[PDB]
Design a protein around this motif. Structure first.
Motif, PDB file in Angstrom:
ATOM      1  N   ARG D   8       6.556  -8.538  15.542  1.00 61.51           N
ATOM      2  CA  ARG D   8       6.017  -7.235  15.730  1.00 61.51           C
ATOM      3  C   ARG D   8       4.491  -7.570  14.760  1.00 61.51           C
ATOM      4  NH1 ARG D   8       9.241  -3.828  17.231  1.00 61.51           N
ATOM      5  NH2 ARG D   8      11.401  -4.714  17.760  1.00 61.51           N
ATOM      6  N   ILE D   9       4.048  -6.367  15.506  1.00 65.74           N
ATOM      7  CA  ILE D   9       2.771  -5.409  14.899  1.00 65.74           C
ATOM      8  C   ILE D   9       2.539  -4.779  13.789  1.00 65.74           C
ATOM      9  CG2 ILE D   9       0.943  -4.342  15.135  1.00 65.74           C
ATOM     10  CD1 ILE D   9       1.034  -6.826  16.687  1.00 65.74           C
ATOM     11  N   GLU D  10       2.510  -5.189  12.785  1.00 64.47           N
ATOM     12  CA  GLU D  10       2.417  -4.234  11.152  1.00 64.47           C
ATOM     13  C   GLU D  10       0.847  -4.954  10.600  1.00 64.47           C
ATOM     14  OE1 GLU D  10       2.464  -4.555   7.536  1.00 64.47           O
ATOM     15  OE2 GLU D  10       1.092  -6.535   8.225  1.00 64.47           O
ATOM     16  N   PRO D  11       0.999  -3.602  10.244  1.00 64.71           N
ATOM     17  CA  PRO D  11      -0.591  -2.721   9.201  1.00 64.71           C
ATOM     18  C   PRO D  11      -0.878  -2.922   8.606  1.00 64.71           C
ATOM     19  CG  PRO D  11       1.492  -0.734   9.503  1.00 64.71           C
ATOM     20  CD  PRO D  11       1.580  -1.778   9.545  1.00 64.71           C
ATOM     21  N   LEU D 151       8.744  11.625  -0.052  1.00 66.71           N
ATOM     22  CA  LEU D 151       7.884  10.447   1.004  1.00 66.71           C
ATOM     23  C   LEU D 151       7.069  12.241   1.421  1.00 66.71           C
ATOM     24  CD1 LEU D 151       6.649   8.190   2.680  1.00 66.71           C
ATOM     25  CD2 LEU D 151       8.698   9.400   4.045  1.00 66.71           C
ATOM     26  N   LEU D 152       5.964  12.260   0.991  1.00 68.34           N
ATOM     27  CA  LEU D 152       5.199  12.985   2.195  1.00 68.34           C
ATOM     28  C   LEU D 152       4.556  12.944   3.538  1.00 68.34           C
ATOM     29  CD1 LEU D 152       3.541  14.117  -0.862  1.00 68.34           C
ATOM     30  CD2 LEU D 152       6.012  14.988   0.235  1.00 68.34           C
ATOM     31  N   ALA D 153       4.322  11.733   3.954  1.00 66.88           N
ATOM     32  CA  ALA D 153       3.383  11.113   4.674  1.00 66.88           C
ATOM     33  C   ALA D 153       2.868   9.605   4.468  1.00 66.88           C
ATOM     34  CB  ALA D 153       1.911  11.715   4.709  1.00 66.88           C
ATOM     35  N   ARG D 154       2.713   9.179   5.628  1.00 67.19           N
ATOM     36  CA  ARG D 154       2.303   8.178   5.846  1.00 67.19           C
ATOM     37  C   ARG D 154       0.294   7.434   6.654  1.00 67.19           C
ATOM     38  NH1 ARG D 154       6.881   5.446   8.646  1.00 67.19           N
ATOM     39  NH2 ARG D 154       8.026   4.951   5.849  1.00 67.19           N
ATOM     40  N   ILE D 155      -0.039   6.773   5.769  1.00 70.31           N
ATOM     41  CA  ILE D 155      -1.437   6.259   6.298  1.00 70.31           C
ATOM     42  C   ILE D 155      -1.467   4.820   6.379  1.00 70.31           C
ATOM     43  CG2 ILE D 155      -3.318   6.609   5.697  1.00 70.31           C
ATOM     44  CD1 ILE D 155      -2.889   8.542   3.858  1.00 70.31           C
ATOM     45  N   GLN D 156      -2.047   4.545   8.031  1.00 69.17           N
ATOM     46  CA  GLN D 156      -1.502   3.329   8.151  1.00 69.17           C
ATOM     47  C   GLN D 156      -3.347   2.734   7.996  1.00 69.17           C
ATOM     48  OE1 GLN D 156       1.732   4.547  11.269  1.00 69.17           O
ATOM     49  NE2 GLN D 156       2.103   2.260  10.334  1.00 69.17           N
ATOM     50  N   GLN D 157      -3.233   1.633   7.961  1.00 69.96           N
ATOM     51  CA  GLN D 157      -5.438   1.287   8.559  1.00 69.96           C
ATOM     52  C   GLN D 157      -4.975  -0.017  10.008  1.00 69.96           C
ATOM     53  OE1 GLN D 157      -6.926  -1.698   5.352  1.00 69.96           O
ATOM     54  NE2 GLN D 157      -7.834  -2.890   6.903  1.00 69.96           N
ATOM     55  N   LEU D 158      -5.940   0.805  10.481  1.00 73.93           N
ATOM     56  CA  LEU D 158      -4.943   0.479  12.108  1.00 73.93           C
ATOM     57  C   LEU D 158      -5.965  -1.470  13.135  1.00 73.93           C
ATOM     58  CD1 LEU D 158      -5.406   4.030  14.209  1.00 73.93           C
ATOM     59  CD2 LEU D 158      -3.535   2.603  13.018  1.00 73.93           C
ATOM     60  N   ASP D 159      -7.279  -1.461  11.750  1.00 74.72           N
ATOM     61  CA  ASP D 159      -7.972  -2.554  11.605  1.00 74.72           C
ATOM     62  C   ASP D 159      -8.724  -3.292  10.782  1.00 74.72           C
ATOM     63  OD1 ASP D 159      -9.015  -4.189  14.153  1.00 74.72           O
ATOM     64  OD2 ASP D 159     -11.668  -2.729  13.477  1.00 74.72           O
ATOM     65  N   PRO D 160      -7.915  -4.311  10.408  1.00 76.19           N
ATOM     66  CA  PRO D 160      -7.018  -5.472  11.992  1.00 76.19           C
ATOM     67  C   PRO D 160      -6.019  -5.154  11.440  1.00 76.19           C
ATOM     68  CG  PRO D 160      -7.572  -6.477  10.283  1.00 76.19           C
ATOM     69  CD  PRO D 160      -8.308  -5.085  10.048  1.00 76.19           C
ATOM     70  N   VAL D 161      -5.042  -5.772  12.310  1.00 73.98           N
ATOM     71  CA  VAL D 161      -3.290  -5.580  11.769  1.00 73.98           C
ATOM     72  C   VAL D 161      -3.108  -8.076  11.763  1.00 73.98           C
ATOM     73  CG1 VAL D 161      -3.041  -3.280  13.574  1.00 73.98           C
ATOM     74  CG2 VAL D 161      -3.009  -6.359  14.432  1.00 73.98           C
ATOM     75  N   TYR D 162      -2.096  -8.148  11.466  1.00 72.61           N
ATOM     76  CA  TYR D 162      -0.833  -8.403  11.175  1.00 72.61           C
ATOM     77  C   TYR D 162      -0.038  -8.452  12.053  1.00 72.61           C
ATOM     78  CZ  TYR D 162      -3.012  -8.842   6.661  1.00 72.61           C
ATOM     79  OH  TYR D 162      -3.850  -9.140   5.218  1.00 72.61           O
ATOM     80  N   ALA D 163       0.100  -9.971  13.137  1.00 74.39           N
ATOM     81  CA  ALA D 163       2.055  -9.630  14.003  1.00 74.39           C
ATOM     82  C   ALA D 163       2.362 -11.157  13.118  1.00 74.39           C
ATOM     83  CB  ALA D 163       0.869 -11.041  15.569  1.00 74.39           C
ATOM     84  N   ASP D 164       3.685 -10.454  12.401  1.00 78.46           N
ATOM     85  CA  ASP D 164       4.814 -11.429  12.219  1.00 78.46           C
ATOM     86  C   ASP D 164       5.910 -11.898  13.013  1.00 78.46           C
ATOM     87  OD1 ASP D 164       3.255 -10.999   9.195  1.00 78.46           O
ATOM     88  OD2 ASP D 164       5.463  -9.501   8.470  1.00 78.46           O
ATOM     89  N   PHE D 165       5.216 -13.185  13.529  1.00 77.01           N
ATOM     90  CA  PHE D 165       6.138 -13.828  14.798  1.00 77.01           C
ATOM     91  C   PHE D 165       7.003 -14.586  13.287  1.00 77.01           C
ATOM     92  CE2 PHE D 165       3.632 -17.162  14.250  1.00 77.01           C
ATOM     93  CZ  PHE D 165       2.300 -16.736  13.937  1.00 77.01           C
TER      94      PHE D 165
END
Lengths: 199, 149, 323, 247, 50
Positions: D8-11, D151-165
């Motif tokens: 899965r792609i994880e930020p 929990l109020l919001a979620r902020i994700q960094q879109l570049d780069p990404v880690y793929a946890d296989f």
């Protein structure tokens, strides 16, 4: 299975008749391939997962009807011969062509062709048995052999009459003509005895 | 994992799927291309069976069937075995239908088997050990001789 | 291309009115179901301890004010005297320091009184937002506020409403790739159409937000659309269908659906009326299915003379008579 | 040898913006789905109590500063007098000790003021990291931070990404063995290739970390690679099959 | 009126809320027409020796 193939669940007791309640997806919801994708299924956690999340539709070609004969896969090829042409020659032509097929492909006859095959097989020795039995009866009755051969010379004339008549009108050599021929032969033989016994 | 889990995974995952065809009757007056859905449900070779998922996590890790079991193509039943002169063989008992000739039937069977032996694998050979028609053939050929003599 | 996605109506603003202070609910001021304005008093929790805390803080403030008054009097008396040196400059600076310290203590006590006053005001539970209030989750005499913030009542805003619908991830990725590769131009500006299940009630809205994180369990991305609800017909939580546009094709080619053939490999092809009335086979990639026509993506150009009949009785290159 | 592994792609960075304080969300200052910078205001929690606590801390600071000013004046006056013995050295030492005590109290009051100020700033809900903020989990007028960090919001960094296989463990040991006796060469330097099911885009990435622990329920170790995500094609949570070189 | 999911409060989900229920053919594979209009038919076969 339930959405597109319809599933029969249980028995509907329709005023004394046991008919089956059927479940199927709605007409508008199964008209397109996209409708297959729009279906949802439940996961273990209780949410519903759309089909498009894990299924992809690829087109290909397949059999809408599979035909098997004597247990092997088959194609059923049927037709009618050209007008004025015998069926036996058509079977001859068909077996000739089928011989040119790649090895491993068998050809079989079914129903009408099988029946025509066995009939054409049996006719000849049927005639032969008839002729030998009438000969033997005639030698029994006439206490001789020459008189039997004498009377038996009659039947080709009746056969000639039947054949010329049918050819003039052009009818085929069907079973009806064949039995007409055999009864004509019988009456011609009756005629021949009715002359020769007094002779 | 318990054996019930592996059995049930096999049962639900190796099943044919009667999907159907979209555009089926009763069909809309508009759509005009019914076509089959032909889902693949059953598994053909040991590789496919070893891919039966026993337990899969959300992360992606999965437990396939082959990870716990050895999968192969074998006999449904191992009660009986047969040998022919010390080499592993197979055999079948052909029985005559009522009211039928034996000699003709035996010759038909032998000719058919020899014709098929042309397509046999080279390592394997056919042989007919027992034939109840041989005894009748020798018996009739002797009795005919006794009648003539 | 329009997609109907499963969605639920959510109110734009929801306020879960929760009791912050422990006590016995004395009176419920609001009637259930009515519209409430901001600051409208809803519940009345007994202010037995909070009133006492405010009284204590006020006593402390009163002491601080007394000390400030004394220091002010000291400085007022010392100020004319220090100019004629009737008191030492050290004593005057000490008096000034005492005055400033007393002012600081009065400010601190005012802050403490303000803290106690806010805590007491937490007992007169008021509507934080304007909207439609629901049932009263508690009745008079119930003990609330102990252990957890007890839920007292809920307020929702009924106009406009959100529609948080959801889309499979793969459809979104295909749409994005098609937009980037250029087959289909995006249709973000086109308004979402809302349809309520079982009713002819249709509404229009706009897409606001497209989530970037695919749901792990369902493999979907969430989208949020804002819909006007002037009559209050759209109800929170209702299941609805949203027709989201999936991009616009300026040169879409649609042909009768019966006029598409497929080969053994799955490649679709179309019989075309070429020059000299000769039937040509042009391969085609087929898109979606609309009504009784297939959307064609490539393999066709405007003005192509397609044959939509006798497809079973036509071989390539055979001569045919157009109608 | 490439093994296609589910993953899965994880930020890279996830900021679950939470309420550090109890209060009613007065405003929402951002638009959902927008890219926010670090330190941008997201939510405004009612600063009623924290402003009062800050006022109290400032009052204590003012009192300490007044005492400090008094002590400084006293020492300045006593400084020339002790030089001519007009005041006892003991008195001047007491005055200097009072001045040092006043300075220390001023430091303590400043520390208290800073604690109160940062507590107040906790009511200005700011984005801790730059990234894409999602839907607001709470609306204006909702009570957050009571009891738990809502929990109020979620902020994700879109570049780069880690793929946890995930790799089957026994396969990893078998490859490690084959490397050990030398039948095969380690392919650690070969880049990973990730293909998202159903689309034609291919992304290259570098293996980062291979786990040491084994998943109890499945017997497979997890892995992590990093893939550049310039166009935003890869989303967090997508199921991806990662082709990993096996020597 | 088949209950699909019912809560303790009293709210229920009946079958008709999700599906259209009607009396129809068990199978829609075959249809018969007699001169342009929907018809039905049966083949009566003679018993042996009659």
């Amino acid at each position: 299975s339930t959405a597109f193939g319809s599933s029969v669940i249980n028995d509907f007791a329709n005023a004394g008749r046991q008919q089956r309640v059927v479940v199927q997806a709605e007409q508008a919801e199964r008209m397109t391939p996209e409708s297959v994708l729009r279906l949802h299924v439940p996961n273990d956690s209780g949410s519903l997962v759309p089909l498009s999340a894990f299924v992809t539709t690829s087109w290909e070609e397949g059999p809408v009807q599979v035909a098997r004969y004597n247990g092997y896969p088959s194609i059923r090829i049927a037709g009618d011969a050209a007008p004025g042409v015998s069926t036996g020659e058509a079977m001859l032509e068909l077996e000739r062509i089928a011989a040119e097929l790649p090895e491993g492909i068998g050809y079989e006859w079914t129903g009408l062709s099988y029946q025509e095959r066995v009939a054409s097989g049996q006719a000849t020795m049927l005639f032969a048995l008839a002729i030998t039995v009438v000969f033997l009866l005639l030698v029994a009755l006439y206490e001789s052999w020459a008189i039997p051969l004498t009377v038996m010379l009659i039947v080709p004339v009746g056969a000639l009459g039947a054949v010329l008549a049918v050819t003039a009108i052009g009818l085929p050599n069907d079973v009806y003509f064949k039995v007409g021929l055999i009864t004509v032969i019988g009456l011609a033989a009756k005629n021949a005895i009715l002359i020769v016994e007094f002779a | 994992l318990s054996i019930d889990d592996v059995n049930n995974a096999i049962r639900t995952q190796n099943v044919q799927v009667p999907a159907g065809a979209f555009g089926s009757t009763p069909g809309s007056s508009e759509q005009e291309l019914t076509a089959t859905l032909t889902v693949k449900g059953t598994l053909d070779n040991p590789e496919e069976f070893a891919a039966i998922v026993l337990r899969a996590n959300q992360d992606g890790s999965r437990l396939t069937l082959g990870d716990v079991a050895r999968i192969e193509v074998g006999s449904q039943d191992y009660n009986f075995g047969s040998r022919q002169d010390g080499k592993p063989a197979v055999a079948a008992a052909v029985q005559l239908s009522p009211g039928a000739n034996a000699i003709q039937t035996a010759e038909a069977v032998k000719q058919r088997l020899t014709e098929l032996s042309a397509n046999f694998p080279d390592n394997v050979e056919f042989s007919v050990p027992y034939d109840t028609s041989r005894f009748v053939d020798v018996a009739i050929d002797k009795v005919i001789m006794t009648l003539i003599e | 291309v329009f997609a109907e996605l499963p969605g639920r109506i959510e109110p734009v603003r929801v306020a879960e009115v929760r009791a912050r202070v422990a006590g016995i609910v004395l009176k419920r001021t609001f009637e259930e179901g009515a519209d409430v304005k901001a600051g409208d008093v809803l519940f009345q929790i007994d202010p037995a301890p909070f009133k006492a805390a405010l009284s204590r803080a006020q006593g402390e403030l009163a002491r601080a004010e007394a000390q400030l008054f004394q220091a002010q009097a000291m400085v007022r008396r010392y100020e004319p005297l220090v100019k004629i040196d009737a008191v030492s400059q050290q004593d005057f600076d000490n008096a000034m320091a005492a005055l400033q310290s007393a002012q600081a203590d009065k400010r601190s006590a005012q802050a403490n009184v303000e803290t106690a006053r806010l805590d007491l005001g937490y007992a007169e539970v008021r509507a934080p937002i304007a909207g439609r209030i629901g049932r009263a989750q508690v009745t008079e005499g119930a003990l609330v506020g102990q252990g957890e913030a007890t839920l007292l009542a809920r307020i929702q805003q009924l106009d406009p409403v959100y529609a948080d619908f959801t889309q499979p991830a793969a459809d979104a990725l295909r749409l994005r790739a098609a937009i980037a590769e250029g087959k289909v131009a995006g249709a973000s500006d086109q308004p979402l159409s809302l349809r309520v299940d079982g009713t002819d009630i249709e509404r229009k809205g706009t897409l606001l937000f497209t989530d970037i994180s695919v749901d792990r369990s369902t493999g979907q991305i969430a989208l949020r659309g804002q819909f006007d609800n002037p009559e209050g017909v759209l109800l929170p939580g209702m299941y609805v269908r949203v027709r989201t546009p999936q991009g616009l094709n300026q040169n879409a080619i649609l042909v009768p659906q019966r006029a598409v053939q497929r080969s053994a490999d799955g490649q679709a092809s179309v019989m075309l009326l070429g020059e000299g009335d000769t039937v040509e086979v042009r391969q085609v990639t087929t898109g979606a299915m609309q009504g009784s026509r297939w959307q064609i993506s490539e393999g066709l150009q405007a003005g192509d003379k397609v044959i939509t009949s006798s497809l079973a009785a036509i071989r390539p290159g055979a001569k045919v008579i157009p109608r």
